[PDB]
Design a protein around this ligand. Sequence first.
Ligand SMILES: [Cl-]
Ligand SMILES: [Cl-]
Ligand SMILES: [Cl-]
Ligand SMILES: [Mg+2]
Ligand SMILES: [Mg+2]
Ligand SMILES: [Mg+2]
Ligand SMILES: [Mg+2]
Ligand SMILES: [Mg+2]
Lengths: 393, 393, 393, 393, 393
Amino acid sequence: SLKITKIEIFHVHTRPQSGQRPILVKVSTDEGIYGLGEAGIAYGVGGSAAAGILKDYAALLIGEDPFNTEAIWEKLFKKTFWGQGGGTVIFSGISAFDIAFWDIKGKALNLPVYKLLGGKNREDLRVYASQLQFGWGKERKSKGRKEEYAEEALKAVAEGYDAVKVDVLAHDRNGSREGVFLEGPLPSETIKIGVERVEAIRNAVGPDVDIIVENHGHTDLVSAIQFAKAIEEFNIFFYEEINTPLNPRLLKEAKKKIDIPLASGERIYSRWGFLPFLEDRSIDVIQPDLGTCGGFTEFKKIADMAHIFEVTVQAHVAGTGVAEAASLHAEIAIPNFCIHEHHQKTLLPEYEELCVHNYQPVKGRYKVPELPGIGQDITEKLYQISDYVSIEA
Amino acid sequence: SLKITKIEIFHVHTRPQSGQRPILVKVSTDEGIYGLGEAGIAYGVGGSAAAGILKDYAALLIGEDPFNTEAIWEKLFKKTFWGQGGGTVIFSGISAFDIAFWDIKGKALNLPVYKLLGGKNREDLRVYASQLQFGWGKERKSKGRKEEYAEEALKAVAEGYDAVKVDVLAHDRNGSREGVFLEGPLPSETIKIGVERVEAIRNAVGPDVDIIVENHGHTDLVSAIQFAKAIEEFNIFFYEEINTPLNPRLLKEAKKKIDIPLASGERIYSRWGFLPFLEDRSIDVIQPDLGTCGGFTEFKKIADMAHIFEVTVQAHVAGTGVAEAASLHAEIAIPNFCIHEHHQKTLLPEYEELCVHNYQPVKGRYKVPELPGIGQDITEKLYQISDYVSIEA
Amino acid sequence: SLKITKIEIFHVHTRPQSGQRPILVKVSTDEGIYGLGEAGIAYGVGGSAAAGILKDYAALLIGEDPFNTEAIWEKLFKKTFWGQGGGTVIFSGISAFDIAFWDIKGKALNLPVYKLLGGKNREDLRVYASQLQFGWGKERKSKGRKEEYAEEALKAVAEGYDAVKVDVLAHDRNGSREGVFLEGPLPSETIKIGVERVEAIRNAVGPDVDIIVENHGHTDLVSAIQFAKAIEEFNIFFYEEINTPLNPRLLKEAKKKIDIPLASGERIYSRWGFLPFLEDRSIDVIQPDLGTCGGFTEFKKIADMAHIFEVTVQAHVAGTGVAEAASLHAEIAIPNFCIHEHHQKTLLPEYEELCVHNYQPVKGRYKVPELPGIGQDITEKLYQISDYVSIEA
Amino acid sequence: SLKITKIEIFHVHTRPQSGQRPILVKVSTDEGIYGLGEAGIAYGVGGSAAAGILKDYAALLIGEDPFNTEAIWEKLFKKTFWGQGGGTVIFSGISAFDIAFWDIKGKALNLPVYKLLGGKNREDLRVYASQLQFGWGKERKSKGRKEEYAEEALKAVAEGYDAVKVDVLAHDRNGSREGVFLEGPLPSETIKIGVERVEAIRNAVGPDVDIIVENHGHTDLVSAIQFAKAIEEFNIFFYEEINTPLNPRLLKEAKKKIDIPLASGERIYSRWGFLPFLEDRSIDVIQPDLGTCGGFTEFKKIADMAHIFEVTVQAHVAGTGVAEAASLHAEIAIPNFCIHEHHQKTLLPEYEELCVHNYQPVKGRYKVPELPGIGQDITEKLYQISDYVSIEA
Amino acid sequence: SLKITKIEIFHVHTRPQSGQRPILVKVSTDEGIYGLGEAGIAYGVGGSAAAGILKDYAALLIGEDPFNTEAIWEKLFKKTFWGQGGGTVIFSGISAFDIAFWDIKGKALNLPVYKLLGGKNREDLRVYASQLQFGWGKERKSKGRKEEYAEEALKAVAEGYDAVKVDVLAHDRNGSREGVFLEGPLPSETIKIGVERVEAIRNAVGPDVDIIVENHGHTDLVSAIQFAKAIEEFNIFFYEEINTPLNPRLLKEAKKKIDIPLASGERIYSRWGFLPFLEDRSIDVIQPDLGTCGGFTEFKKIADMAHIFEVTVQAHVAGTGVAEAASLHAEIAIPNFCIHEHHQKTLLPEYEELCVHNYQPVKGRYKVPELPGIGQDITEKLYQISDYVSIEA
Ligand SMILES: [Cl-]
Ligand SMILES: [Cl-]
Ligand SMILES: [Cl-]
Ligand SMILES: [Mg+2]
Ligand SMILES: [Mg+2]
Ligand SMILES: [Mg+2]
Ligand SMILES: [Mg+2]
Ligand SMILES: [Mg+2]
């Protein structure tokens, strides 16, 4: 019965500490039910392109029935022209709408989204404390000294996390990115900086806390192999984004010389994006972002394909409470779940103020929301602190 | 929440003129909502195994929540031991229950199942008239002379079908399977018999009615290629089950020498079954059966994977109205739908008396049921004409 | 030395006949020299995303030296985060700025851009008349009857073109896209519509006018193969965008069964996008758009790589005179040039009014502009008929 | 001129300690000779399906000559329809009948089955003590403490076994499966539990007793590789069922990382099942079960193919004395035999009461039974403690 | 407007200490602007062939516009016949002229060549001291005793280099090449010679000076693997020219059993030469020589292709100041630069006297020349100490 009547797009003004700008969409229907979604380009450079694609796709969606998520997905894929060429922004547009549609379906049926995605596969979700190099962390500040890495890890363990993730190569010993270059064979001292940080954490947290190493795509396969050799002895849980994902075969080549499990996904989009990595079996833990991979509809398809290849899933989660709530539904509903990412940015007040619920882990575990829909909404403030665009018929 | 309280399995007694024995399952819950499913082993030899697998799986399912379709599928896959070895019977067990679970979800939410599978991708479904060699099709009788093949095709066209399917190799000119053997290089006269039948049909129906050729796995790659060469000139729509699917690479070898699109699926099960054929891109139209491929849950995963490879889908449909109703929901909910199989057996009173609703095409088109759930139920007669097993707490 | 002081972005208001919205960028320097570029998303759905990416990238570019095209390209690729994930909009942003930078270089050195790209490889360029199905063509109007396809081809041949391109599958016999669906095996009547149009064209123009068939990615590999079989007898020059380019291996599968040379590239971006197609040798003529592939800098890299594989190049050209002027420099400067696309849209006044020079073929031949830079500028009107964004300094 | 006149199927009632339900078949002939076979689904979930398949196949077998084992195998493969789709239950049905037919042949000719399979290749068979985690003896009790694993190993060594097999991951330190999950990257403590058990056993038994590690398909590629790293220092003889065998390429991927010889077979069926593993050379020791792989006929074909690839064989043995007696014939008759699997579960009263003869190793060595046929029979008790089905003529 | 009017070729007489004979080309135009280039065959046996190819190519070049570098490259490739067969001498001829043409372009536009190649990617270039085994300084002398290898490394470190390259296998302990044979499995004593030299250098320079090992193609894959095993513990930066490059697959085989990054390129020419190594991903650092790979034009294409594969570039540099000056422009203008080779020969007076500027690193860093053109010229002496050939209209 439902028809989309209004689409509102919020390109949120710069968040002071992080410098980031989340992009949210509110999709309203004739019956007054609305849904929230998020485009997963809150950080880096390109958020205005996400706000733009959402505006353009909106014209094709007014009048549509939000229950028709398969047909709408395929329409944005096949009828936009650019859908068939793919891309970060193209897929973020499809994703944000898809999330909002599933939010609507949940509300329309009086059920949490995970009940519409195939139910629960576990009672709760293991969580890791993500991006310790920026502090754990209501004050965001990049860390340079090895004792600071250990300290931030200890703060997370004190809160009950039994896993942490850290980028140990990005910053020099002053905590600056300035002059740090990580492609090709690395100097001994750069390797030493990474190793001393991993070692300081491992010593501090002991053997029963897992450590994930994040390279942020700053390395390439040559430097990634070199660094893995140096940190292997520390029992690394997995090794994330070790190069550029645009020539997929290179990760298979990296894996030939790296024994640590490999992870990637935040810059790989749709079934088509993940396919070559699965064919190569070069990724052990995939990390699709609901807000870029294609939404709930596509995340499920990616995870389901990945299961055939004995690959597990950790959703990439790095924006507002809309993104984070949504991720919990997607992860609880798949059998092949690894671990949940809990980003340090969620601990900053600039992010906390955006949503009505601040879902936080308890003793390092997350439970899925049990409200109808995704279980999240934006605050009334949002209109006033965003570039705002409204589309109707 | 919702819990399974009772499971009833009906291994239906021999259907007089088809010789078949459908296997249905009724899953009851603590809220009085029940679901119907079907195991796709109604013909050939093995129905009692399907009845037996359902009985064994039932022990694991009493007390479960039918909304947890993902977890239950994974439990039957991973906790039975044999799930991980796979197979016709193993997957038919998972399938029949999965269908009944989705029926339950639809009834619980007062929605047709297609609304829970992602909505409609089209307003109706193109249908073909299947298995003309048995007559179209109120009486089942094998055809021998080429004019009989033309006549049955015309009977279909008169009902408004614009596509037909025929097995032209299975029967000799007297309509007998006796002494017919179709592996290895074929006699000229066997080629001639097949060609004369396709030719008679094509001449009768004209260019605008599609002709699908069914080999029923009676051929192997050698005889399949030899026959394809002889019938290519007749514009064959696709060419189904041309060999044994147990060594998948053989179909890739077949495709090297066959220009006609290839179809298969009724004897290929789960994502894991279809994977090699997709990797080889050797099937143009996959034909999973809901009742053997793993139910709605797995059908969707198969179809969604197939989409990546520009492969389209026609559900294999060859049992009761429970199977047929369920297939309509699965097909309308996918973007990459090809055509729907309407089997001649449904036209027989043996089968019609099993189910409450008799869904039939109108002018060669099917519409999905709009009732809650799959839109089908079993008649009162079923308890009296089945081997009946009931499992409770 | 040279520093970028200002960036202006023009998202041009809807063009009436075509419904399109070009996106232009003007980059100004501290020496008063400015350059023009264009993002190649003027048609389909997503122009606002291109406007948005240009705005976001502009922040990284103020103060940069436009001669540093390599470092700026790598910066936008490696320092934006999303650069390394790729995509239509991501690469369109890099492309538009890159074109403007080369325009600046040419003006600064008082040379046409081709002199900075390695000089002329030929004195002029062979051209085809592109998109006959919309009319050749100061009035845009989709054609339905086969005689109309012949008529439009003759109009082109009368202007001295010895090659034409037509999409013969997209429209029904009424000139309408409504209800036309071209994935999976095709009905005989759809094949007949396509065939009769190719045939009518070939009969009208004779043997010495080449015919390119454009599928616009509406087909998939199955329908593409079926159609190629039907038209091969008409000596098709090449066969463009026959499926979705997101799973590259599928084009290799298509080539196995298609004798006609294959073309693609308007929805493939960067060296990374073309690589798998070259690895498979599945494309005979690549068609990168300067405004999406990565600009002059990357177009050259794509073409140079393609040469190793005995692949030739026709730039995809389908926007304003900025895009068209730019493409002439890129094409004259490469050894492996095939033919130049001259789009019917350039014939419409809504496009004519946007630029200072209206470069048009003479006797089916293009000459490269000989003015400083790309040899093109926007009109004063542009500010008044665009969504306008200015970024300083 | 033997003709099958009667087939009796015994689905044995729950065995109290093991929880298992063996499935036996007795095939009688016109001349009074009968044969015994067993379907290898006695454990896990699915035994009723094996009972059902045997009932269905039985109809095709009345009147056949038991000497025509090749034709009968091919008939059940090719004329049942589901034969060509394969599977655990499908092949278990073929298997059990085949074993009974060879039993008949041996009785008819006054020869043990090994004489009809090509004779002895050795005078006796090396044996390992299997499944120490449930105790070495005939009280079934799952072990949790590392000392208990060593104690059980020493009990076997005391009986003269020079090889043991243990699953060291399945149980927590209290001996429970509850909450144990072994897919994806494993916690350090789970690794430690496995290691401490292997190390306890190694230290106890010394260097000249071999240790096989059984993962029971509870792990996947990722966890299997991780665990192999931790135990490789202990000289593991081979490493069994390390993942799910349904995507065979994954075992090749595992072997890239894992230096310990790999074994699998109990969930892989027929020549067709083993083929991809042999093509990849990913299994060093294959473990087909006579009662699921296709019987003596197919076991021989599998073992003979495996010999080409320098792969050796250990029959999977885990049901009644029928299965155990049969396995000894199959193994002594092949050149490429590795080792025989033994449990003492065999000589529980619940299992020992089923069969006339109790074949047991002596000082870690087995002799093949030297009686006509397989050298085994069922007791009179069986009729009374089984679901009994009889099919006649 | 420019036309080539005169070509002069200087095959320089034997340089006393090195024994080498550089080959230089001076290309003059009607406007009086001239350009200098160099063929990269100054050492080994074949320089007279380089002089001869330049003489032959010169005939095709009189009257050409040196701005037409793409067309001229393609003309020498496609119109000489032997261009399409390839080769050291064939490509050296194209190379030397290409360098001279770019020199002319820079001069004609008052800009350094790097400004015409896409600008700077960095402000300076890291340098290594190359070929320590011949002495680091003004007197060339082959080293035999391990202490001498350390001594030479220390002399480099004292001048501010943080990287060195050495061939440790070429010479026996008395500093002789005679009787040294390095193909096939090596004697222990030869391994010990190489090891003791690497160890002496590592001990002398510490961890923060990188060590490159040069095999000069004297080894093959067997000895290369053997030696890598022995030196892996010394943290070798990369491992250069480890076999013969004429069967490219062999380097892929070597990489399977070598963990040190591999380098090659001075005996690999054009995009076509590097292609198979990139396809195999067997080279981590490519080392094309501007004077053999095809000049600036082709170096850029090689480096750009290499970038797709996460391969970095160090120009091979080993003749006069013409070659070295040219190399700095090529390297600063690419994003994927590794390190610059600074050859000990440049420290000899025989080489210094050939060119007007002696560009030398400062504290181990190079800056690109900023003069117009390549920033280098020959002395007027050169006519008198060369075999001189002049070609005019
Ligand atoms: Cl994009
Ligand atoms: Cl089965
Ligand atoms: Cl040569
Ligand atoms: Mg990350
Ligand atoms: Mg069929
Ligand atoms: Mg096009
Ligand atoms: Mg086992
Ligand atoms: Mg060298």
